[PDB]
Scaffold this active site. Structure first.
Site: not given
Ligand code: NA
Ligand SMILES: [Zn+2]
Length: 258
Positions: A62, A92, A94, A104, A117, A196-197
């Site tokens: 992801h 990580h 997005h 996000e 993030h 947010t996941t």
């Molecule tokens: Na993770």
């Molecule tokens: Zn994130």
């Protein structure tokens, strides 16, 4: 995992497996800069990343995470709205399929090309797994990326993406200094929110920096070459791995600046 960012398993579907998706303190949100309250009691952030030890970069299907050794107080965040010391565990991003989307959080409905993030957990809970079950367990620093000049300190990350193209690949990734990802100013907005996941737990004090960093078109292009799928499966490019803004509901965004 079954969840993802497509038409059939994307964010509008997540509530069926993770009912907290429709909770009272979900992230991300739109930051309305005129409604954010200046709070002169907020302290400066204290970022101590001089002793950070990165270990590994991996594609988890992801996003890709850079993981740090968090078995001692080596890279920590303190101050701001935080109590206590929070240790860096991973960062990580997005990002989008085009430069006009990918972040996000949004700022007066403005989307940025990507969002970084840096994830940290409260050392009073002893490990990340216990921290995610507490309302003050995580602190995530969010940094917007706009497209313009290259960021030299990001190049080491973009150069290894070739080696973790598909889900489940990992590579050694040592001596990476996350101080090269920080903007000049540490002014920020803060609010209480969630991962947010999935599992979308409501355990996050968000700290979103006002100043974006610039990255080059060629740098974000290389993010868009990664895949959601595992090796040998049909190719699905890893793009638009962002969740849309959620309602603010009963929450105030505070600013460290006027
Ligand atoms: Na993770
Ligand atoms: Zn994130």
């Amino acid at each position: 995992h079954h969840w993802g960012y497509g038409k059939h398993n994307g964010p509008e579907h997540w509530h069926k497996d993770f009912p907290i998706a429709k909770g009272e303190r979900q992230s991300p949100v739109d930051i309305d800069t005129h409604t954010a309250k200046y709070d002169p009691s907020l302290k400066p952030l204290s970022v101590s990343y001089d002793q950070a030890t990165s270990l590994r970069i991996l594609n988890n299907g992801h996003a890709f995470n850079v993981e740090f050794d968090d078995s001692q107080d080596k890279a920590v965040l303190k101050g701001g709205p935080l109590d206590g010391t929070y240790r860096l565990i991973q960062f990580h991003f997005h990002w989008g399929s085009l430069d006009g989307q990918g972040s996000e959080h949004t700022v007066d409905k403005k989307k940025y090309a990507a969002e970084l993030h840096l994830v940290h957990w409260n050392t009073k809970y002893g490990d990340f797994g216990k921290a995610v079950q507490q309302p003050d367990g995580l602190a995530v620093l969010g940094i917007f990326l706009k497209v313009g000049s290259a960021k030299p300190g990001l190049q080491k990350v973009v150069d290894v993406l070739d080696s973790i193209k598909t889900e489940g690949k990992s590579a050694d990734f040592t001596n990476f200094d996350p101080r090269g990802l920080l903007p000049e100013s540490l002014d920020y907005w803060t609010y209480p929110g969630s991962l947010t996941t999935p599992p979308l737990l409501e355990c996050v004090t968000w700290i979103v920096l006002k100043e974006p960093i610039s990255v080059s078109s060629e740098q974000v292009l290389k993010f868009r070459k990664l895949n959601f799928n595992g090796e040998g499966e049909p190719e699905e490019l890893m793009v638009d791995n962002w969740r849309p803004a959620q309602p603010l509901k009963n929450r105030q965004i505070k600013a460290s600046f006027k």
